[PDB]
């Protein structure tokens, strides 16, 4: 669907409504400017053909006709300026209003809108959709009107000069319109066809580049490479056919134009010889009507662009038309004055609109008084965060009524209520400004003294003092520059600066140490006496000193009372407390050196295509020189027939040679792009995981490099050799011939050819539009939008949208002025290079009359020099426009050859190394330090050590991100540590073979990822370089207890699975990951988070195959669920990388340490 036309120009004022009307009138005038030139030129050639009478008064008459040409030139100068300037100004101002209103509408949106609509889609639709609207209401509409005016002027001038000859053109004119329409529609950046061809291979590229570590883990690079190559060859085939047909179309356009010349002259000489028309009358009519018919097709991309703009405006306007159910832009709600903390919930049933079939809540009733510290305890899934979100009115409850000190929310203001409730969420985000602004983000008017007070209440002033720019430090994106503890404490301060009336903490001390959490809680109890408070966390240290503790079960608050009340109640909380106690190099031709025959044929055909322009200049001059000589009717009839036949033969040659040049260069270019994509992708795969770490080149840079290199390198190689050759042939022959024929006129015209060529280029660039507008500026503006869509979760709490929209507008204020000036400049350059042609006509034919009068050259020679040098410098402009840039192509080639010759640490195709015939299975790590390359200043390990024997079920337990999967990567050769020693059965991994190690063991990743194929080819990814038997495919499925969910689906072993397994559930993809690794039969096995999303009955059937297969092979399981940790052989707890405790489980349970506190979570 698409908008109306009245609803596209919705943001148009009286000033924008004037610009469009006057630009439309000026475009009509500009349009009619050219057929009048052909009328004057036809009338002028009769002054030169009847000049010599057996030359007096030739220079007077050429003076008058120079005035005519210069008057038309001035008229077109003024009208073309007005046209382009006024349409680009109307579009610019309107697009500005649309950008602002679109973003302002995105801000006033219900929560969860972003979950429904991905935020890369919002951030991309923003820019793409506004550009797609801008294109259609800009100068494309002016060009449309200009071409309709040219059409009508052409046919009126035609029919007025002579109707008999115009009717014949009009009979063959629809074919001309179709030829031109098809040509320009094909021409309007036919690049999306290549994107549509490469879409599927890009899908494979994005799959493999989402799970690079996984594919490297299984070692199956070759399989994914075969897949990419198959997709690639398909796209290559489609491209070859597209080149064939596009070039056939250009060829038939040229054939039709030339055979039209042939017919026009064959019948026009019949009319001239009969005495009815003259030769000027025939030139007038033929050129007027031909130009009108071609101008109708020069306006076909405008209807396309307008349809696309209409389509995109529909989406945007629909986004800005919806009004959510809650919005801080409505002042209807009443603001209270005497603020008193009181919470009343009663019969509160609520469900998430994202998944409304499930009901987490089934009514909660609660009454909380002022200052009453209420804690809520329960497992993750009851919805503590759901209650926190329910509080601030992020949603509305489906049943009941909620109230805060008497009256209900549903009749009072959302903004006022939102500001007085200081809330901290589970995972805070921090804005990438200075920290002073971050803490200022509480409210508007906060001075530095209050800032210091709040930061000293947060006890986060030490790391403020040790780091430079103590109030000027720009924190990185998503709080990466500082640590987690500092970040959470300053987030607490950021909440406190608002001076709230109700405080709501949710997991305020997730990764916090002892003394900082203690001082934080002391400060929290320093500012709780005037404010209501609700705290949600896991640590029971900051819970025992509360007012009232409650307990969630199935969303329902079941237990109520104080501490001793739930002690004597002996419930789940009693169980809890009972258990707790730079350069650029040229090698681009060597890349394409295998396809030499295509280039030989292509350069030959390009030489001919360049020569076709002077040949036409010569034939045209000679036909018009048949009627300036004093010959009989038989001589004129025979010579006219000869030259009309020559027009036809030149048409056929043009058809063949255009087809051939296009086809051979296209085939060579497509072979080059397929080979380049293949080689680059194979090189990417052969890079280890350490190269991919770089945030520049992890996901987007590589896929954009594939889809950019493809086009660019064929651009350089084909453009250079074809355009340089075609234009050398064309202009060189033109200028040499026109020098031997007349050298004075040639020297005069040789000063005007630059402007004619560049005029062609500026016009064609106007036809293609603008690829990029205000790039730097668009970055400056879109950074704000990115950081405002990413931090939406936080910013709806902070209620700082207004203060964010103003930042957006301020960021827009520079590109706006820049764009209006750019329009006023482009209008001038376009109008001047358009009028230059009329002035060139005038100057050349006044000089020509002078020469002819002094008998220094003939008329036919003036006409030949003019046609070869001027009619044939426009062609240089067109050809040079159509060619793709060489600078971007050459830098792209530099990057491609960098990636191609790129040499990684270890070679994947290297079998060299220690290859023992036997192994033992014992591993030993000692004093092993690991620092991430991306984070060289932050150490995650401190020289850990381990000892592993055969069959030893070694468990690893710790906090999140403490070096859990680090030991996994440190075994699987992803990272080699700077210091340490790793003995694998007395064999150091650095001297062994690199594929053998990765071949012997087998693991399950943290998150299961499956490939775009059936489940059969998902499990048969585990064993490669080997013939997989289906009896092991069903065996591994029965063993993993997925055989039931396979044998149930239609096309059981050929059911096509979505990307990452988005079709089936998390438990099944976790099982089929267990079965994917099960077929490996590894002598060393690792498990990371083996029971993340799995049922309780499914864990026993998963582990039962593990327990029976644990024997013989070393086993290492890392999980959070204690069930697999109790039965393990030995357990190793980590703390910031350091091995704290190690030994048998009983020895760890005898001496109570930190592991005892880990066992004390929920048992009893």
């Amino acid at each position: 669907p698409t908008v109306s036309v009245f609803s596209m120009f919705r943001y148009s004022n009286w000033l924008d409504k004037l610009y469009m009307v006057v630009g439309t009138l000026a475009a009509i005038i500009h349009g009619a400017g050219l057929p009048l030139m052909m009328l004057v030129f036809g009338e002028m050639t009769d002054i030169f053909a009847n000049a010599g009478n057996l030359f007096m008064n030739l220079e007077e008459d050429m003076t008058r006709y120079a005035y005519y040409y210069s008057g038309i030139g001035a008229g077109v100068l003024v009208a073309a300026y007005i046209q382009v300037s006024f349409w680009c100004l109307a579009a610019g101002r309107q697009i500005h209003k649309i950008r602002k209103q679109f973003f302002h509408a995105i801000m006033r949106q219900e929560i969860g809108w972003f979950d429904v609509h991905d935020v890369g889609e919002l951030n991309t639709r923003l820019t793409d959709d506004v550009s797609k609207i801008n294109e259609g209401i800009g100068d494309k509409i002016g060009m449309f009107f200009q071409s309709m005016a040219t059409f009508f002027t052409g046919f009126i001038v035609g029919f007025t000069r002579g109707w008999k000859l115009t009717l014949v053109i009009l009979a063959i004119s629809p074919v001309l319109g179709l030829s031109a329409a098809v040509w320009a529609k094909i021409l309007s950046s036919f690049t999306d066809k290549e994107l549509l061809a490469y879409a599927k291979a890009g899908a494979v590229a994005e799959e493999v580049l989402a799970a690079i570590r996984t594919v490297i883990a299984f070692g199956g690079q070759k399989k994914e490479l075969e897949r990419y190559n198959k997709n690639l060859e398909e796209a290559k085939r489609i491209g070859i056919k597209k080149a064939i047909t596009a070039n056939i179309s250009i060829g038939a356009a040229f054939l039709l134009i030339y055979a039209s010349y042939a017919l026009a002259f064959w019948y026009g000489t019949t009319l001239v010889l009969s005495g009815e028309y003259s030769i000027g009358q025939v030139l007038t009519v033929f050129f007027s009507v031909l130009i009108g018919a071609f101008s109708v097709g020069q306006a076909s991309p405008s209807i396309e662009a307008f349809a696309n703009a209409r389509g995109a405006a529909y989406e945007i306007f629909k986004i800005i038309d919806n009004k959510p159910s809650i919005d801080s832009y409505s002042k209807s709600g009443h603001k209270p004055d005497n603020i008193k903390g009181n919470l009343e919930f009663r019969n509160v049933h609520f469900s998430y609109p994202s998944r409304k079939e499930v009901k987490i809540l089934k009514g909660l009733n609660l009454k909380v008084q002022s200052g009453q510290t209420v804690a809520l305890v329960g497992n993750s899934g009851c919805g503590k965060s759901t209650t926190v979100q329910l509080m601030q009115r992020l949603y509305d409850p489906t049943e009941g009524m909620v109230s805060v000190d008497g009256q209900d929310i549903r009749t009072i203001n959302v903004r006022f209520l939102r500001e007085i409730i200081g809330v901290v969420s589970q995972e805070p985000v921090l804005f990438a400004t200075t920290i002073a602004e971050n803490i200022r983000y509480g409210r508007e008017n906060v001075t530095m003294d209050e800032i210091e007070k709040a930061v000293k209440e947060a006890n986060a002033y030490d790391f403020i003092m040790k780091l430079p720019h103590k109030f000027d430090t720009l924190v990185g994106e998503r709080g990466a520059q500082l640590s987690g503890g500092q970040k959470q404490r300053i987030a607490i301060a950021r909440a406190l600066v608002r001076n709230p009336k109700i405080l709501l903490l949710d997991e305020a001390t997730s990764a916090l140490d002892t003394e900082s959490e203690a001082v934080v809680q002391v400060a929290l109890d320093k500012a709780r006496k005037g404010r209501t408070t609700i705290v949600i966390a896991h640590r029971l240290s900051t819970v025992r000193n509360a007012d009232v503790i409650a307990g969630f079960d199935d969303g329902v608050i079941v237990e109520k009372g104080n501490h001793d009340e739930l002690m004597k109640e002996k419930g789940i909380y009693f169980k809890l407390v009972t258990m707790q106690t730079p350069v650029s190099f040229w090698r681009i031709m060597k890349l394409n050196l295998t396809e030499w025959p295509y280039f030989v044929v292509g350069v030959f055909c390009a030489i001919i295509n360049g020569g076709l322009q002077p040949a036409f200049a010569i034939i045209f001059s000679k036909i018009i020189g048949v009627f300036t000589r004093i010959d009989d009717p038989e001589t004129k009839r025979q010579n006219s027939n000869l030259f009309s036949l020559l027009f036809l033969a030149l048409g056929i040659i043009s058809f063949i040679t255009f087809f051939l040049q296009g086809f051979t260069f296209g085939k060579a270019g497509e072979i080059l792009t397929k080979r380049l994509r293949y080689m680059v992708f194979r090189s990417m795969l052969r890079q280890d995981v350490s190269w991919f770490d770089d945030p520049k080149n992890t996901t987007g840079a590589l896929t954009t490099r594939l889809a950019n290199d493809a086009a660019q390198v064929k651009g350089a190689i084909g453009s250079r050799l074809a355009v340089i050759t075609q234009n050398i042939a064309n202009l060189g022959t033109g200028i040499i011939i026109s020098f031997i024929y007349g050298w004075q006129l040639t020297l005069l015209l040789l000063a005007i050819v630059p402007i004619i060529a560049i005029a062609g280029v500026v016009e064609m660039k106007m036809l293609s539009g603008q690829a990029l507008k205000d790039k730097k500026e668009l970055e400056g503006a879109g950074k704000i939008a990115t950081e405002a869509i990413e931090n939406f979760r936080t910013v709806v709490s902070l209620t700082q949208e207004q203060k964010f929209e103003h930042m957006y507008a301020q960021s827009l204020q520079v590109p706006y002025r820049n764009s209006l000036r750019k329009a006023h400049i482009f209008g001038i350059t376009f109008s001047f290079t358009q009028a230059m042609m009329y002035f060139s006509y005038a100057g050349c034919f006044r000089f020509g009359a002078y020469l002819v009068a002094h008998k220094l050259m003939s008329f036919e020679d003036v006409l030949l020099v003019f046609s070869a040098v001027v009619f044939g410098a426009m062609a240089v402009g067109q050809v040079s426009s159509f060619a793709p840039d060489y600078a971007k192509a050459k830098i792209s080639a530099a990057h491609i050859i960098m990636i191609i010759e790129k040499t990684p640490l270890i070679d994947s195709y290297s079998t060299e190394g220690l290859m023992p015939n036997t192994l033992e299975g014992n591993v030993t790590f000692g004093e092993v330090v690991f620092n991430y390359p991306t984070r060289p200043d932050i150490p995650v390990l401190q020289g850990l050590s381990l000892e592993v024997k055969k069959g030893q079920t070694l468990a690893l337990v710790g906090s999140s991100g403490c070096g859990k999967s680090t030991v996994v990567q440190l075994l699987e050769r992803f990272y080699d540590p700077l210091a340490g020693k790793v003995l694998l059965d007395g064999k150091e991994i650095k001297r062994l073979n690199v594929q053998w190690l990765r071949a012997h063991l087998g693991i399950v990743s943290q998150e299961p990822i499956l490939f775009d194929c059936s489940i059969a080819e998902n499990i048969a990814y585990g064993d490669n370089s080997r013939v997989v038997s289906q009896e092991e495919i069903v065996r591994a499925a029965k063993e993993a207890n997925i055989h039931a969910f396979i044998e149930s689906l239609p096309n059981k072993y050929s059911t096509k699975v979505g990307d990452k397994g988005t079709q089936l559930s998390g438990g099944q993809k976790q099982r089929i990951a267990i079965a994917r690794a099960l077929v490996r039969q590894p002598h060393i096995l690792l498990l990371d988070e083996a029971t993340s999303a799995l049922d309780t009955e499914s864990e026993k059937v998963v582990q039962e195959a593990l327990d029976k297969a644990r024997e013989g092979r070393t086993c290492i399981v890392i999980a959070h669920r204690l069930s697999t940790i109790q039965n393990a052989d030995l357990i190793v707890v980590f703390q910031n990388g350091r091995v704290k405790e190690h030994g048998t489980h009983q020895q760890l349970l005898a001496q109570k340490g930190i592991y005892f506190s880990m066992v004390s979570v929920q048992a009893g």
Partner: antibody, heavy 119, light 113 residues
């Protein structure tokens, strides 16, 4: 005014080869069709040959084609007629004549040149 | 071939009378362009022929208005009014409409005295 003069006509034995030249001044020779016309001793005019303005097209009557051959030299402004396999009936007075716009065939005649073919 | 035949072979005209010659063709000359080309030439004793009307009823630059031509189809004629002694010679009728160009025989004009 237009001045065409002719030269080269003399007595020739039958079967011989002669060559006539006609020099043209006062107009742009390289723009005009030019013809040779012939007047017999009974005083009956007969067209002989025609050549166009570039030198491309030439037209002869059946009687005389094959034996006669017309050419023009645009640089010296000259018109030539080469004659071979002469006959007694080709004895006559030869005129060069210049073509006229508005389509009249012989606007400006030259003076004669007399050619006799006898023993 | 198309052959022109002129009706009077000799014509005697008193000084001041009117003289009418006619040149009936044989194939009804008309070109493919719809123009019919039929010119009259006058040879005065001792000079080269001179143009006189370059088609049916036109007049060459310099030719008095006494000479007039008129003709249609396949019959054409020339009439002179108020002959003088200066106008005294042989009148030929050339036709260049068909592929061999042919002159007529001629009509000697003789003024009485």
């Amino acid at each position: 005014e237009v001045i065409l003069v002719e030269s080269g006509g003399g007595l020739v034995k039958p079967g011989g080869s002669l060559k006539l030249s006609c020099a043209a001044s006062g107009f742009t020779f390289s723009s005009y069709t030019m013809s040779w016309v012939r007047q017999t001793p009974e005083k009956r005019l007969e067209w002989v040959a025609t050549i166009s303005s570039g030198g491309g097209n030439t037209y002869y009557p059946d009687s005389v084609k094959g034996r006669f051959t017309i050419s023009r030299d645009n640089a010296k402004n000259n018109l030539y007629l080469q004659m071979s396999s002469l006959r007694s009936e080709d004895t006559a007075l030869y005129y060069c004549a210049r073509y006229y716009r508005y389509e009249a065939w012989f606007a400006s005649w030259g003076q004669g040149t007399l050619v006799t073919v006898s023993a | 071939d198309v052959l022109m035949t002129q009706t009077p072979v000799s014509l005697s005209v008193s000084l001041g009378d009117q003289a009418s010659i006619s040149c009936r063709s044989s194939q009804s000359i008309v070109h493919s362009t719809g123009n019919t080309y039929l010119e009259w030439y006058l040879q005065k004793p001792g000079q080269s022929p001179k143009l006189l009307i370059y088609k049916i009823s036109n007049r060459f630059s310099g030719v008095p208005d006494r000479f007039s031509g008129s003709g249609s189809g396949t019959d054409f004629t020339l009439k002179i009014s108020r002959v003088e002694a200066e106008d005294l010679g042989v009148y030929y009728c050339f036709q260049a409409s068909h592929a061999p160009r042919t002159f007529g025989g001629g009509t000697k004009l003789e003024i009485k005295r």
